[PDB]
Structures are given as structure tokens and as C-alpha cells.
Amino acid sequence: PMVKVATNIPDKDVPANFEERLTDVLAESMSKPRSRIAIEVFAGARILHGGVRNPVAIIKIESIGSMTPEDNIRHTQKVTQLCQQALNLPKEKVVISFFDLSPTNVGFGGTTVAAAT
Amino acid sequence: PMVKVATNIPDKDVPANFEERLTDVLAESMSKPRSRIAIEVFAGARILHGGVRNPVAIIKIESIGSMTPEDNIRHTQKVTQLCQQALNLPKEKVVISFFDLSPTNVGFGGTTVAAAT
Amino acid sequence: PMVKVATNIPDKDVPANFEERLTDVLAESMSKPRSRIAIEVFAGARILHGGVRNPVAIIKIESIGSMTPEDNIRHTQKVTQLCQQALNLPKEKVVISFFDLSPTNVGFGGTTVAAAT
């Protein structure tokens, strides 16, 4: 799974263990090995949400599966709870987009996931 | 809707009201409330387009609906016109990608849009 | 085609000709004109992959076609080989996501690709 977190919170306010916690949250929620999770953090970013500059996190999550409607409720709940705790964000300032990719459309280790299976 | 604008124009040359104008443009074009629009601006970025470093904007727009082929022509026209005016970009230096998401695949306020409906 | 490369390698370690080489690689692999390829490089980024901070590249590639399963193996191989050479990355530290867009969902030159055809 590949995650991008963009936030207007300053990078020094995003704790150094945030990525590791998010890795662990999504490994459990998505049933995926920690070894195949990437987290990108773009903090101190220029973001407007709902017309204001209040702290916000805009998150994108890509995965091969584990993205049924029901799964995505669980992910939303878990990711949001982490952001509440670690980023001091209200739930209405955590936006997540979910992309379910075919293994034919993910490259890793020099070939697609589909070709390595 | 969630928008990411990456540009090699310096951040001080992207006017402070750009995001608000883009918010308003897309609220009208997409028939969506301003309260549910996020704009991320990554300016001063390292971009090459068509082999050159000339000023350019690469934009991604995600939305739940409002992305028929006809809708996306209108969005392109409107977004491009804003970038022409505010970013001093020719139209051939404004590239936009449109992603139409299921409400099952957007999290907001601690659950999916689908679960909140 | 539109490419985003995020890496935790420092920007001064990403050679200035990286984007041009990647442009050329994908023009050949995807059979697309150099004039319609954008490369965004977000270097010096905060990334965790597999729980560690080792150098890594997380890449997103969008295209109108040229993204059959077989095509994406070739792209993965070629892009990975470039990153091995230019970024000093092992193949298991190059992750790529492939998005195949409709021409109705790409704006360029003030209208969609579909409307310009």
C-alpha cells in the first residue's frame, strides 16, 4: 500500500513516529505486511479546505484490494483516530481518498505485482 | 472535491487568494459546497514538461461525480482560465487529471461519504 | 503522460538530467511524444517504506492508454533500471502506481484530450 499525507501542520509538529504508527494501523486494517507499506508525509504544505487555512490532513491511500466499502469505513475510522491523536485534527479535517489498484498496475522490485505472483 | 496543484512557479508568485478563487471556480463548475473543497498547492516544485522547465501547472482533481466528459470540458476551461489569469500560464502549460470517486472511497469526518448519506 | 516521483534522496542528489532521461524512457516505453510528458520530482521528502527511512522512490504514472498488464511490466523494468542507475536505488526500493485515464478525463490546452481529437 502507498499512502500520501499532505498537511498544513508544520513538519516539526508531525511526530517522528507518525509514519510508523500509520504503517502499523494500515497493516492491521488492510491485512498487509509492514514491509510493503510506504508513507509519504508532505507537511508544512499550502492547503485551503472549506475556504480556510485551519489545520487539515488530505490523505491518499492506494492498495491492491482491502478496499471494499466496509473496509474503507474501518480504514477511515482508524486513520482518522490516529490523526486526531497525533496531529490534533478534528475528524472534519481529515479527508481520505481510496484507490484500489489491480496488481497489474503496481510495479515493485522491477516488475509488476501481477508478474511476481 | 480534492485538488492538487503542482507548479514550478515560485510560491511567492502564486497569489495568496489563488486557492480561494479555485475553490469558488470548482464549487460553481462541479455544483459542490465550498465547505467540502480542498486545494493543495505545491509551488516552487521541480517539474519538466515537454522537455523544458518553462512555467507549468500539473493539476489533479478528485470528486464524487460531476465528472462526465462534458463536465470535464467545463472544468478544464474554467480552471485553465484561472491559471492563465493568476499564474500567467498559457493553456498548453495547464495539465489536469480527473478522478471520479465512489462515495464508498472517500473518507471524511471519520467515516466514508457513503456511510454518512 | 504525467509522472510524479517522490523520494527521500536529497534534491541535490537527484541529477539535473533525471527528468529528461525519465521523459525519454517513457516516451519510448509508452509510445508518446516527449512534448506531452510531465515529470514532477519531490525530492528530500519525508518517506517511510517497510518501516525504514532508507532511500526509496515512490512513483505515480498516469497515461491515456499504453497501460496493458504487459506494457506496465516494461515500464516498471525501464523506470526501475533508470532509478537504479541515477538514484542508486535497489529495485525493492522503487514502487510505481499506474493509472490509465480516459481522454475524457485529461485536460490540456484548455479542453479535454477527448474534445481535441
Automatic annotation (TrEMBL), chains A, B, C:
SUPFAM superfamilies, sorted: Tautomerase/MIF
Domain of life: Eukaryota
Alphabetized InterPro entries for the sequence: Macrophage_inhib_fac, Tautomerase/MIF_sf
Gene Ontology CC entries for this record: extracellular space
Gene Ontology MF: a single term: phenylpyruvate tautomerase activity
Family label: Belongs to the MIF family.
PANTHER family tied to this protein: D-DOPACHROME DECARBOXYLASE (PTHR11954), MIF-LIKE PROTEIN MIF-2 (PTHR11954:SF37)
Descriptive protein name: Macrophage migration inhibitory factor
